[PDB]
Amino acid sequence: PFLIGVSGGTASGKSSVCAKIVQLLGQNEVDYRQKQVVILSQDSFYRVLTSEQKAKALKGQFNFDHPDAFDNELILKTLKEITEGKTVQIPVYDFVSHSRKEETVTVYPADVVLFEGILAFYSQEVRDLFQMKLFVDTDADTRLSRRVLRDISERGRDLEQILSQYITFVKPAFEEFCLPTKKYADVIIPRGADNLVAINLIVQHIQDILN
Amino acid sequence: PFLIGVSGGTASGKSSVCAKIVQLLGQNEVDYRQKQVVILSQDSFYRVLTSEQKAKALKGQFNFDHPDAFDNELILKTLKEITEGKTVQIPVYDFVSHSRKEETVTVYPADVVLFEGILAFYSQEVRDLFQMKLFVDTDADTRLSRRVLRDISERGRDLEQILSQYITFVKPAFEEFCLPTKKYADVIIPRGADNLVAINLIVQHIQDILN
Amino acid sequence: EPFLIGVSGGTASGKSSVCAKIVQLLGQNEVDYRQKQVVILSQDSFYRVLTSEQKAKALKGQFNFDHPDAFDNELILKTLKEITEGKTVQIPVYDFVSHSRKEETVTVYPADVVLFEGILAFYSQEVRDLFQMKLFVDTDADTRLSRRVLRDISERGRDLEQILSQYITFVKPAFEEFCLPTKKYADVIIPRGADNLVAINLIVQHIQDILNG
Amino acid sequence: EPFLIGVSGGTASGKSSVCAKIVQLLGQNEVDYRQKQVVILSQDSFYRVLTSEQKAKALKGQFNFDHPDAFDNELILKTLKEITEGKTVQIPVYDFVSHSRKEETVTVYPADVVLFEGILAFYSQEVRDLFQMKLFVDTDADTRLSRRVLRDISERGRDLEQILSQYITFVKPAFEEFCLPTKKYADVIIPRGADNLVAINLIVQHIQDILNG
Ligand SMILES: Nc1ncnc2c1ncn2[C@@H]1O[C@H](COP(=O)(O)OP(=O)(O)O)[C@@H](O)[C@H]1O
Ligand SMILES: Nc1ncnc2c1ncn2[C@@H]1O[C@H](COP(=O)(O)OP(=O)(O)O)[C@@H](O)[C@H]1O
Ligand SMILES: Nc1ncnc2c1ncn2[C@@H]1O[C@H](COP(=O)(O)OP(=O)(O)O)[C@@H](O)[C@H]1O
Ligand SMILES: Nc1ncnc2c1ncn2[C@@H]1O[C@H](COP(=O)(O)OP(=O)(O)O)[C@@H](O)[C@H]1O
Ligand SMILES: Nc1ccn([C@@H]2O[C@H](COP(=O)(O)O)[C@@H](O)[C@H]2O)c(=O)n1
Ligand SMILES: Nc1ccn([C@@H]2O[C@H](COP(=O)(O)O)[C@@H](O)[C@H]2O)c(=O)n1
Ligand SMILES: Nc1ccn([C@@H]2O[C@H](COP(=O)(O)O)[C@@H](O)[C@H]2O)c(=O)n1
Ligand SMILES: Nc1ccn([C@@H]2O[C@H](COP(=O)(O)O)[C@@H](O)[C@H]2O)c(=O)n1
Ligand SMILES: [Mg+2]
Ligand SMILES: [Mg+2]
Ligand SMILES: [Mg+2]
Ligand SMILES: [Mg+2]
C-alpha cells in the first residue's frame, strides 16, 4: 500500500484537500469495499479522556494539541497493519462531546492511503511509513478564521471558548510541535483545497499508481 | 513638541499601549487643558465616505485598510500645526456608522504627542515628523482574535462580516502596506499593553522629557 | 499548445538545478535538438545590454541585476508568446563573467513542455498567466547566500567582498521587495531544492504523462 | 541589588556592539575598574574547555559551539547569582583564535547595572528570571552571515569555506532550534543593531536614570 502523509496546522485545509483528491479520483462513486484510495484521520486516534480531563475540555482548558493527546501507539500499530495489507477497525471521534463512539470503522486494504493530521509527522516511526509527505501551508490568521466558523457550525463550540482555547493551547502547540515538522514534507501545498493545480498534481500521481 | 509615532497591525495593541503610557504618567488625573501628553489616533482622519462607499462598508466590502482610506493631507497639515505649537481641532470618527460626527476635539499644545495608527509610518513626510517610532508587533492570529471580540462589542459588527472583511481587505492590506513600514521603527514592542517592561521604558523616557 | 511551467525562487535556491534534473530524468539530453519535447528557458538569458558606465559599476558589484528593470521584460513576454504559438524562437546567451550578452544564440524549436525559470519569473502578471503550473523553490536566504558565495567565486570569477556587498545592497532588498511578494502565486512550493528527489520525480511523472497524451 | 539586563540575538546580530556603545555612552570606559557602575558580561567567556579531539574538530569547523551544551551553564548561573548578591566575581577570558580559555582573567567588582549578552542568554529559565529587562537584537540571518564571514576572516583567523560549513552545519540549525524560540521572552526588540542610535540612547537614558536613583 502506498501511504501518503498529510499535515499542516489546524484548519489549514488538510481534510478538504484529501476529500477533494478522492473526489476527483472518482472514489466517491465506488462501493465502500471497492475503494482504491481511503482517507484516515489522526483525530480518530485521540485518547479517551479521564473525568478530570473531560471536565477541562468542556471549559476549553484541555490541551488537545499536545502530542500526548493522541494515542501514538495505536496510530503506529494501525498503520503498520495497514502496510501489511490487513483489514483494521479504527475509532470514531466525536468533537461535540470530546469522546469516542462505541462504533468503529472498518478499513479494508486499499492501494493508496491518505493519513492526515496536525501532527502526522511528529513521530519518526510513523513518518518513515509514508512514501510521500505533503504539508498544507496556510497563514495562521486565515486558519483561525476558518476554525472559528467550522468549530461553531460543526463541533458545537462557542466563539469565546474557541478563541480562548486557540490562544491558550492551539497556537503555542502549533509553533512548538507542528510547525517544526514542516521540514519533513516533500511538497508544500499553499492555501488548501482551492489550490487546484496542486491537487490535480497529486491526483494524477495517485492515478498513475492505481494503474 | 516631541512627537512619537506608533504603528502596528490591526488590534496589535497600539491604542492600549498609548493609553497605558499616559495612564502610568498620571495624565488621567490632570485637567484636559493641563495634559502634558496627548494621544492622537489616525482613525480620526478616515475620509468621509460617499454614498456608494458607505453602502459597501455596511456590507463589509469597502477597503478601510488602504492608504487612500485616510485623509493623508489633513493628517500632515494637522501634525505640522501641532509641531508649530498651535491649537487644532480634529475629527471624531464613529466605527459603528462608518462616519464622522459633527463634533470635533480640541487638541491643545502638549509637550509630548503620541500619534498611533496602522499606517502611521506609510507617508514619508509624516514619518519625518516623528522623533521616535515604535512598532507594536503581535502575531496575526492573535490580532484577529482580539479584533473579533473588540469589533463585536465596540464597533457593532457581526462575526461573519468581520471575518469576511478581514480576509478580503485587512490581511492583504497589512502585508502590502503596513508590514513594510515596520523597518522604519526605532524600537519594536511585542505583544502590546501587557508588556510592562517595554511600556515602563517609554514612560520613563517621556517623563525624562517632561522634566 | 505547449504546456508552460513557471519556476521561481531566490538566487541560488536550486531553481536551475531542479529544472536541469527534471529534463535529464525525462531523457531529453539524448533527444535531437530539433526533436526536444521539454526545454528550459532561463530568465537570465534576457538580461539587458549594459552601457559603458553600467558595466564599469557591475565590475565593482555596484549595479542592480536584481531589479525588474535589469531584464528585457518585453523580449521575455514576446518570446514566451511566440513559444505558446508553436513558433521556433531565438534565445540570447548571457555571460555572467563579462556581464554581457554573447554573440552565439540558442534556437528553441517547438516543444510540448517548457520550463521557464528565473528569480523574477512571477513578477509580471502577463507572464504569470502564460504558465499553466507555477513552482517556487523555497530555500532559506542564509543558505542561499552561502551557496551563492561559493558559486560566484568558483564559477563567475567574483571576489568574496564584492559578492557580499552586492548581496546586501541589491540582491537581498530586491528579493524581499519584488520576489517574495510573488511567492503567493505559486501552486506548489518545493523545499531542499535539487536534493528533493520526491518532488522532482513528481514533476517528472506529471510531465511524462502530459507527453504521453 | 544590581539591575541585570539580558541581551540576546543571533551570531553577529550586533549584541556586543550595542552593549559596548551603551557602556561607552554612559562614560564607563573612563571610570576606575573598581568603580565601574555598569559592566558587560559575555556568555562566550563561559565556553567550555575543549578536549584534544574536540579542539581538533574545532580547528576544522566541525565542533558545535552553538548548542547549549557548549557553554558552562552552571558557571554562568553561579556567577550571575553571585553578582546579584553584590559579590566580586572572577570571569574567564575566551580566545576565539585558539578555541581556548586564556589564563588571564577579568575581575568584576560590585556594579549597579550589569549587561549580560550572548547567543543563548535567554535559553535557561533560571538565568532569564535573573534579568529585570530583556532585549533582543534582531538582525536578518543573511545579513548576520555576511557580517560573520567578514569578522571571522579578519578577526578570528578562519577560512571562508570552513566558516560557511560551520554555519550551515551548526550555527544556523542551533539558532533556529535554541535561540529563535527564546525571542518571545524579550521585552524589547532592537533592529539595525549598533546603528540604531534611537534605541541605544533610550537604553542609555534608562540606565542613567537607574544610576541617579
Ligand atoms: N479555500 C477555502 N476557502 C474558504 N474556506 C475554506 C477553504 N479551504 C478550507 N476552508 C474551510 O476551512 C475549514 C477547515 O478546513 P479543513 O479542510 O477541515 O482543514 P484541516 O483538515 O486542516 O483542519 C472548513 O470549515 C473548510 O470548509
Ligand atoms: N494582552 C492582551 N490580552 C488580551 N486582550 C488584549 C491584550 N492587549 C490588547 N487586547 C485587546 O485587543 C483589542 C485591540 O487592542 P488595541 O489596543 O485597540 O489595538 P490597536 O490599537 O492596535 O487596534 C482590544 O479589545 C484590547 O482589549
Ligand atoms: N544540496 C545542495 N547542497 C549544496 N550546494 C548546492 C545544493 N544544491 C545546489 N547547490 C549549489 O547551489 C548553487 C546554485 O544552485 P542553482 O541550482 O543554480 O540554483 P538557482 O537556479 O536558484 O540559482 C550551485 O553552485 C550549486 O552547486
Ligand atoms: N551597521 C553595521 N554594518 C556592517 N557591519 C556591522 C555593522 N554593525 C556591526 N557590524 C559588524 O558585525 C560584526 C558583529 O557585530 P557584533 O556587534 O559583535 O555582534 P554580536 O555581538 O551579535 O556577534 C562585527 O565584525 C562588526 O564590525
Ligand atoms: N475534543 C477535541 C479534539 C480536538 N480538538 C482540536 O482539533 C484540532 C485538530 O483538528 P483539525 O486538524 O481538524 O483542525 C486541534 O487543533 C484540537 O484543538 C478540539 O477542539 N476538541
Ligand atoms: N469604518 C471603519 C473604519 C476602519 N475599520 C478597520 O479599523 C482598523 C484600524 O483600526 P485599529 O488599529 O483600531 O484596528 C482597520 O484594519 C480597518 O479595517 C473598520 O472596520 N470600519
Ligand atoms: N551580470 C550579472 C547578472 C546577474 N547577476 C546575479 O545573478 C543572479 C541570478 O542568478 P541565479 O538565478 O543563477 O542565482 C541575481 O541575483 C543577479 O544578482 C550577477 O551577479 N551579475
Ligand atoms: N571557539 C569558538 C567558540 C565560538 N564560536 C562561534 O562564536 C559565536 C558566538 O559569537 P558572537 O556572539 O560574537 O557572534 C557562535 O555562533 C559560535 O559559532 C566559534 O566559531 N569558535
Ligand atoms: Mg480536519
Ligand atoms: Mg485602535
Ligand atoms: Mg539559470
Ligand atoms: Mg561578545
PDB file of C-alpha atoms in Angstrom, chain A residues 5-204:
ATOM      1  CA  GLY A   5       1.102  11.576   4.918  1.00  0.00           C
ATOM      2  CA  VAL A   6      -0.550  14.971   5.064  1.00  0.00           C
ATOM      3  CA  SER A   7      -0.012  17.569   7.744  1.00  0.00           C
ATOM      4  CA  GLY A   8      -0.468  21.249   8.430  1.00  0.00           C
ATOM      5  CA  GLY A   9      -1.861  23.478  11.155  1.00  0.00           C
ATOM      6  CA  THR A  10      -5.441  23.401  12.360  1.00  0.00           C
ATOM      7  CA  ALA A  11      -7.908  24.314   9.596  1.00  0.00           C
ATOM      8  CA  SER A  12      -5.073  24.611   7.056  1.00  0.00           C
ATOM      9  CA  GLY A  13      -7.153  22.511   4.669  1.00  0.00           C
ATOM     10  CA  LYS A  14      -5.747  19.004   5.260  1.00  0.00           C
ATOM     11  CA  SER A  15      -9.170  17.336   5.408  1.00  0.00           C
ATOM     12  CA  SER A  16     -10.637  19.226   2.447  1.00  0.00           C
ATOM     13  CA  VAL A  17      -7.534  18.551   0.364  1.00  0.00           C
ATOM     14  CA  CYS A  18      -7.777  14.797   0.960  1.00  0.00           C
ATOM     15  CA  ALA A  19     -11.535  14.835   0.313  1.00  0.00           C
ATOM     16  CA  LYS A  20     -11.032  16.695  -2.960  1.00  0.00           C
ATOM     17  CA  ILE A  21      -8.318  14.257  -4.064  1.00  0.00           C
ATOM     18  CA  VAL A  22     -10.519  11.174  -3.620  1.00  0.00           C
ATOM     19  CA  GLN A  23     -13.480  13.044  -5.111  1.00  0.00           C
ATOM     20  CA  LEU A  24     -11.519  13.925  -8.267  1.00  0.00           C
ATOM     21  CA  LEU A  25     -10.335  10.309  -8.418  1.00  0.00           C
ATOM     22  CA  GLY A  26     -13.970   9.217  -8.644  1.00  0.00           C
ATOM     23  CA  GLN A  27     -13.706   7.289  -5.381  1.00  0.00           C
ATOM     24  CA  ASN A  28     -16.992   8.698  -4.124  1.00  0.00           C
ATOM     25  CA  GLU A  29     -18.764   6.743  -6.877  1.00  0.00           C
ATOM     26  CA  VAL A  30     -17.170   3.448  -5.867  1.00  0.00           C
ATOM     27  CA  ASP A  31     -18.592   0.978  -3.324  1.00  0.00           C
ATOM     28  CA  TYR A  32     -17.043   1.159   0.140  1.00  0.00           C
ATOM     29  CA  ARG A  33     -15.412  -2.262  -0.193  1.00  0.00           C
ATOM     30  CA  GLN A  34     -14.069  -1.397  -3.666  1.00  0.00           C
ATOM     31  CA  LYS A  35     -12.434   1.948  -2.816  1.00  0.00           C
ATOM     32  CA  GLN A  36      -8.818   2.087  -4.019  1.00  0.00           C
ATOM     33  CA  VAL A  37      -8.000   5.263  -2.103  1.00  0.00           C
ATOM     34  CA  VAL A  38      -9.000   5.738   1.541  1.00  0.00           C
ATOM     35  CA  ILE A  39      -8.577   8.610   3.986  1.00  0.00           C
ATOM     36  CA  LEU A  40      -7.502   8.057   7.577  1.00  0.00           C
ATOM     37  CA  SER A  41      -7.685  10.943  10.053  1.00  0.00           C
ATOM     38  CA  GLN A  42      -5.329  11.306  13.015  1.00  0.00           C
ATOM     39  CA  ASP A  43      -8.189  12.815  15.023  1.00  0.00           C
ATOM     40  CA  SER A  44      -9.781   9.356  15.020  1.00  0.00           C
ATOM     41  CA  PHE A  45      -6.988   8.369  17.399  1.00  0.00           C
ATOM     42  CA  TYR A  46      -7.473  10.956  20.147  1.00  0.00           C
ATOM     43  CA  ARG A  47      -7.052   9.229  23.524  1.00  0.00           C
ATOM     44  CA  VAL A  48     -10.075   8.525  25.736  1.00  0.00           C
ATOM     45  CA  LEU A  49     -10.357  11.374  28.262  1.00  0.00           C
ATOM     46  CA  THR A  50     -10.493  10.875  32.016  1.00  0.00           C
ATOM     47  CA  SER A  51     -13.140  12.527  34.187  1.00  0.00           C
ATOM     48  CA  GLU A  52     -10.934  15.493  35.098  1.00  0.00           C
ATOM     49  CA  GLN A  53      -9.697  15.881  31.532  1.00  0.00           C
ATOM     50  CA  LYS A  54     -13.210  15.916  30.085  1.00  0.00           C
ATOM     51  CA  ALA A  55     -14.223  18.491  32.690  1.00  0.00           C
ATOM     52  CA  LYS A  56     -11.446  20.791  31.494  1.00  0.00           C
ATOM     53  CA  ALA A  57     -12.189  20.039  27.845  1.00  0.00           C
ATOM     54  CA  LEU A  58     -15.763  21.251  28.350  1.00  0.00           C
ATOM     55  CA  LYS A  59     -14.243  24.509  29.608  1.00  0.00           C
ATOM     56  CA  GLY A  60     -11.803  24.593  26.709  1.00  0.00           C
ATOM     57  CA  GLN A  61      -8.972  24.093  29.179  1.00  0.00           C
ATOM     58  CA  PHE A  62      -7.535  20.792  27.948  1.00  0.00           C
ATOM     59  CA  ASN A  63      -4.625  20.583  25.526  1.00  0.00           C
ATOM     60  CA  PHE A  64      -5.786  18.574  22.505  1.00  0.00           C
ATOM     61  CA  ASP A  65      -2.835  19.931  20.522  1.00  0.00           C
ATOM     62  CA  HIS A  66      -0.086  18.300  22.514  1.00  0.00           C
ATOM     63  CA  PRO A  67       1.479  15.083  21.125  1.00  0.00           C
ATOM     64  CA  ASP A  68       0.267  13.236  24.239  1.00  0.00           C
ATOM     65  CA  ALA A  69      -3.351  13.908  23.255  1.00  0.00           C
ATOM     66  CA  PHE A  70      -3.079  11.267  20.542  1.00  0.00           C
ATOM     67  CA  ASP A  71      -2.677   7.546  21.129  1.00  0.00           C
ATOM     68  CA  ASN A  72       0.603   7.305  19.197  1.00  0.00           C
ATOM     69  CA  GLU A  73       0.944   3.598  19.984  1.00  0.00           C
ATOM     70  CA  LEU A  74      -2.425   2.810  18.387  1.00  0.00           C
ATOM     71  CA  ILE A  75      -1.630   5.003  15.380  1.00  0.00           C
ATOM     72  CA  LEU A  76       1.665   3.223  14.710  1.00  0.00           C
ATOM     73  CA  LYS A  77       0.147  -0.217  15.294  1.00  0.00           C
ATOM     74  CA  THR A  78      -2.785   0.536  12.986  1.00  0.00           C
ATOM     75  CA  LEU A  79      -0.637   1.978  10.188  1.00  0.00           C
ATOM     76  CA  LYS A  80       1.741  -0.989  10.349  1.00  0.00           C
ATOM     77  CA  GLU A  81      -1.107  -3.482   9.972  1.00  0.00           C
ATOM     78  CA  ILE A  82      -2.405  -1.434   7.045  1.00  0.00           C
ATOM     79  CA  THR A  83       1.006  -1.535   5.365  1.00  0.00           C
ATOM     80  CA  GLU A  84       0.787  -5.301   5.915  1.00  0.00           C
ATOM     81  CA  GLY A  85      -2.413  -5.426   3.883  1.00  0.00           C
ATOM     82  CA  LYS A  86      -4.624  -6.316   6.838  1.00  0.00           C
ATOM     83  CA  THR A  87      -8.176  -5.152   7.497  1.00  0.00           C
ATOM     84  CA  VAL A  88      -8.428  -2.988  10.603  1.00  0.00           C
ATOM     85  CA  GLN A  89     -11.017  -1.238  12.773  1.00  0.00           C
ATOM     86  CA  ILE A  90     -10.486   2.414  13.666  1.00  0.00           C
ATOM     87  CA  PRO A  91     -12.153   4.519  16.374  1.00  0.00           C
ATOM     88  CA  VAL A  92     -14.763   7.186  15.663  1.00  0.00           C
ATOM     89  CA  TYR A  93     -14.199  10.502  17.444  1.00  0.00           C
ATOM     90  CA  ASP A  94     -16.940  12.976  18.368  1.00  0.00           C
ATOM     91  CA  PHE A  95     -15.670  16.554  18.660  1.00  0.00           C
ATOM     92  CA  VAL A  96     -19.007  17.659  20.099  1.00  0.00           C
ATOM     93  CA  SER A  97     -18.658  15.522  23.237  1.00  0.00           C
ATOM     94  CA  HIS A  98     -14.861  15.207  23.261  1.00  0.00           C
ATOM     95  CA  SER A  99     -15.169  11.418  23.144  1.00  0.00           C
ATOM     96  CA  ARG A 100     -15.183   8.231  21.093  1.00  0.00           C
ATOM     97  CA  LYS A 101     -18.250   6.355  19.912  1.00  0.00           C
ATOM     98  CA  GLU A 102     -18.771   2.656  20.584  1.00  0.00           C
ATOM     99  CA  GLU A 103     -18.968   2.155  16.824  1.00  0.00           C
ATOM    100  CA  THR A 104     -15.736   1.664  14.848  1.00  0.00           C
ATOM    101  CA  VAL A 105     -14.934   1.956  11.137  1.00  0.00           C
ATOM    102  CA  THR A 106     -13.747  -0.973   9.029  1.00  0.00           C
ATOM    103  CA  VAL A 107     -10.753  -0.012   6.889  1.00  0.00           C
ATOM    104  CA  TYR A 108     -10.283  -2.533   4.087  1.00  0.00           C
ATOM    105  CA  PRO A 109      -6.984  -2.954   2.158  1.00  0.00           C
ATOM    106  CA  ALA A 110      -6.531  -0.101  -0.315  1.00  0.00           C
ATOM    107  CA  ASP A 111      -3.877   0.677  -2.928  1.00  0.00           C
ATOM    108  CA  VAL A 112      -3.369   4.208  -1.614  1.00  0.00           C
ATOM    109  CA  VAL A 113      -3.889   5.515   1.916  1.00  0.00           C
ATOM    110  CA  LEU A 114      -4.053   9.193   2.850  1.00  0.00           C
ATOM    111  CA  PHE A 115      -3.268   9.790   6.539  1.00  0.00           C
ATOM    112  CA  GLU A 116      -3.871  13.385   7.631  1.00  0.00           C
ATOM    113  CA  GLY A 117      -3.441  15.235  10.894  1.00  0.00           C
ATOM    114  CA  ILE A 118      -1.891  18.243  12.609  1.00  0.00           C
ATOM    115  CA  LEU A 119       0.887  16.012  13.992  1.00  0.00           C
ATOM    116  CA  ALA A 120       1.143  13.291  11.334  1.00  0.00           C
ATOM    117  CA  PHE A 121       4.897  13.940  11.001  1.00  0.00           C
ATOM    118  CA  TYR A 122       5.675  14.268  14.716  1.00  0.00           C
ATOM    119  CA  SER A 123       6.650  10.631  15.260  1.00  0.00           C
ATOM    120  CA  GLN A 124       9.681   9.370  13.358  1.00  0.00           C
ATOM    121  CA  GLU A 125       8.414   5.771  13.196  1.00  0.00           C
ATOM    122  CA  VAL A 126       5.133   6.962  11.675  1.00  0.00           C
ATOM    123  CA  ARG A 127       6.879   9.423   9.375  1.00  0.00           C
ATOM    124  CA  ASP A 128       9.003   6.599   7.932  1.00  0.00           C
ATOM    125  CA  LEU A 129       5.874   4.704   6.901  1.00  0.00           C
ATOM    126  CA  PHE A 130       4.931   7.490   4.468  1.00  0.00           C
ATOM    127  CA  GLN A 131       6.247   7.231   0.911  1.00  0.00           C
ATOM    128  CA  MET A 132       5.199  10.835   0.340  1.00  0.00           C
ATOM    129  CA  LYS A 133       4.745  13.736   2.755  1.00  0.00           C
ATOM    130  CA  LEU A 134       2.582  16.755   1.966  1.00  0.00           C
ATOM    131  CA  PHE A 135       2.249  19.834   4.158  1.00  0.00           C
ATOM    132  CA  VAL A 136      -0.679  22.218   3.639  1.00  0.00           C
ATOM    133  CA  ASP A 137       0.630  25.672   4.467  1.00  0.00           C
ATOM    134  CA  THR A 138      -1.985  28.316   5.220  1.00  0.00           C
ATOM    135  CA  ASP A 139      -1.448  31.546   7.184  1.00  0.00           C
ATOM    136  CA  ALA A 140      -2.273  31.394  10.900  1.00  0.00           C
ATOM    137  CA  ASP A 141      -4.832  34.197  10.780  1.00  0.00           C
ATOM    138  CA  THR A 142      -6.567  32.640   7.775  1.00  0.00           C
ATOM    139  CA  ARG A 143      -6.669  29.287   9.601  1.00  0.00           C
ATOM    140  CA  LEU A 144      -8.166  30.864  12.735  1.00  0.00           C
ATOM    141  CA  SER A 145     -10.968  32.439  10.711  1.00  0.00           C
ATOM    142  CA  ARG A 146     -11.732  29.040   9.182  1.00  0.00           C
ATOM    143  CA  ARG A 147     -11.601  27.236  12.523  1.00  0.00           C
ATOM    144  CA  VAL A 148     -13.960  29.691  14.179  1.00  0.00           C
ATOM    145  CA  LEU A 149     -16.654  29.169  11.557  1.00  0.00           C
ATOM    146  CA  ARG A 150     -16.067  25.401  11.369  1.00  0.00           C
ATOM    147  CA  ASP A 151     -15.989  24.818  15.120  1.00  0.00           C
ATOM    148  CA  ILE A 152     -19.174  26.826  15.646  1.00  0.00           C
ATOM    149  CA  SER A 153     -21.184  25.030  12.965  1.00  0.00           C
ATOM    150  CA  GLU A 154     -19.654  21.550  13.231  1.00  0.00           C
ATOM    151  CA  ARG A 155     -18.156  20.957  16.676  1.00  0.00           C
ATOM    152  CA  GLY A 156     -20.755  22.700  18.809  1.00  0.00           C
ATOM    153  CA  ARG A 157     -18.365  25.300  20.215  1.00  0.00           C
ATOM    154  CA  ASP A 158     -18.833  28.933  21.271  1.00  0.00           C
ATOM    155  CA  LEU A 159     -16.804  31.858  19.890  1.00  0.00           C
ATOM    156  CA  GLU A 160     -15.270  32.968  23.181  1.00  0.00           C
ATOM    157  CA  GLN A 161     -14.274  29.450  24.197  1.00  0.00           C
ATOM    158  CA  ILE A 162     -12.827  28.828  20.732  1.00  0.00           C
ATOM    159  CA  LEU A 163     -10.672  31.951  20.816  1.00  0.00           C
ATOM    160  CA  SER A 164      -9.598  31.202  24.383  1.00  0.00           C
ATOM    161  CA  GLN A 165      -8.646  27.583  23.650  1.00  0.00           C
ATOM    162  CA  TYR A 166      -6.850  28.671  20.482  1.00  0.00           C
ATOM    163  CA  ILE A 167      -4.680  31.357  22.053  1.00  0.00           C
ATOM    164  CA  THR A 168      -4.005  29.308  25.194  1.00  0.00           C
ATOM    165  CA  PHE A 169      -3.218  25.865  23.684  1.00  0.00           C
ATOM    166  CA  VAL A 170      -3.622  25.651  19.902  1.00  0.00           C
ATOM    167  CA  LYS A 171      -1.294  28.469  18.836  1.00  0.00           C
ATOM    168  CA  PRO A 172       1.559  27.568  21.248  1.00  0.00           C
ATOM    169  CA  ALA A 173       1.328  23.850  20.395  1.00  0.00           C
ATOM    170  CA  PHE A 174       1.400  24.604  16.663  1.00  0.00           C
ATOM    171  CA  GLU A 175       4.643  26.552  16.973  1.00  0.00           C
ATOM    172  CA  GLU A 176       6.251  24.054  19.343  1.00  0.00           C
ATOM    173  CA  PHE A 177       5.134  20.736  17.844  1.00  0.00           C
ATOM    174  CA  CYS A 178       3.545  21.132  14.385  1.00  0.00           C
ATOM    175  CA  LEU A 179       5.486  23.851  12.570  1.00  0.00           C
ATOM    176  CA  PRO A 180       8.849  22.126  13.289  1.00  0.00           C
ATOM    177  CA  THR A 181       7.687  19.072  11.312  1.00  0.00           C
ATOM    178  CA  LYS A 182       7.154  21.078   8.132  1.00  0.00           C
ATOM    179  CA  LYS A 183      10.775  20.372   7.214  1.00  0.00           C
ATOM    180  CA  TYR A 184       9.927  16.683   6.718  1.00  0.00           C
ATOM    181  CA  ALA A 185       7.442  17.416   3.923  1.00  0.00           C
ATOM    182  CA  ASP A 186       8.424  16.591   0.338  1.00  0.00           C
ATOM    183  CA  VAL A 187       5.957  19.037  -1.166  1.00  0.00           C
ATOM    184  CA  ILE A 188       4.298  22.119   0.302  1.00  0.00           C
ATOM    185  CA  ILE A 189       0.728  22.935  -0.790  1.00  0.00           C
ATOM    186  CA  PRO A 190      -0.308  26.504  -0.006  1.00  0.00           C
ATOM    187  CA  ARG A 191      -3.844  27.686   0.788  1.00  0.00           C
ATOM    188  CA  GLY A 192      -5.581  24.312   0.700  1.00  0.00           C
ATOM    189  CA  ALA A 193      -8.476  22.791  -1.259  1.00  0.00           C
ATOM    190  CA  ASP A 194      -8.828  25.720  -3.684  1.00  0.00           C
ATOM    191  CA  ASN A 195      -5.311  25.014  -4.954  1.00  0.00           C
ATOM    192  CA  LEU A 196      -6.499  23.027  -7.973  1.00  0.00           C
ATOM    193  CA  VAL A 197      -3.141  22.759  -9.738  1.00  0.00           C
ATOM    194  CA  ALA A 198      -1.523  21.298  -6.642  1.00  0.00           C
ATOM    195  CA  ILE A 199      -4.459  18.945  -6.015  1.00  0.00           C
ATOM    196  CA  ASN A 200      -4.515  17.760  -9.638  1.00  0.00           C
ATOM    197  CA  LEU A 201      -0.789  17.059  -9.420  1.00  0.00           C
ATOM    198  CA  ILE A 202      -1.409  14.681  -6.516  1.00  0.00           C
ATOM    199  CA  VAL A 203      -4.436  13.160  -8.235  1.00  0.00           C
ATOM    200  CA  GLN A 204      -2.512  12.380 -11.424  1.00  0.00           C
TER     201      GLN A 204
END
